Amino acid sequence: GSSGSSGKEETEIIEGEVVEIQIDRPATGTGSKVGKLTLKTTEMETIYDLGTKMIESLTKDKVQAGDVITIDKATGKISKLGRSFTRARSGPSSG
């Protein structure tokens, strides 16, 4: 049919370099396990709110800083990939 064009400039997935992983305890607050994850993507870091299912993923694989993990906003699940190739500016090339 006619409907349809070259677009789809919207993805429900984000992959970054696990910068920091904060975990709030039930000691005080509401109850539902809540945490804060930080990933450096696009020469910029963005904080992500972790619910109760997002944490279980960081635990099963004990995801820590330095590693590279993804985030599925569609289902709200996280997966581990390992490492990645980030392009950084240096200047003087030696090779």
Ordered DSSP codes for 8-21: ----SEEEEEEEEE
State which approach was used to obtain the coordinates.
Answer: NMR
For residue 17, give the nearest of 39, 36, 32, 34 by alpha carbon: 39
Rounded Cα distance between 29 and 74, Å, is 27
- Domain spans of the chain, in order of start: 11-84
Helix (H, G, I), strand (E, B) or coil at 29: coil
Angle at 8 between CA 7 and CA 10, to 5 degrees: 135
DSSP letter at 61? T
Q: Where are the beta strands (DSSP E) in the chain?
A: 13-24, 34-40, 45-50, 68-72, 77-82
Helix (H, G, I), strand (E, B) or coil at 54: helix
- Residues 81, 15 contacting (CB under 8 angstroms): yes
Give the CATH number of domain 11-84; options: 3.40.190.10, 2.40.50.360, 2.40.40.20, 3.20.20.70.
Answer: 2.40.50.360
- 17 CB contacts (<8 Å, ≥6 apart)? 39, 40, 41, 66, 67, 68, 84, 86
DSSP letter at 68? E
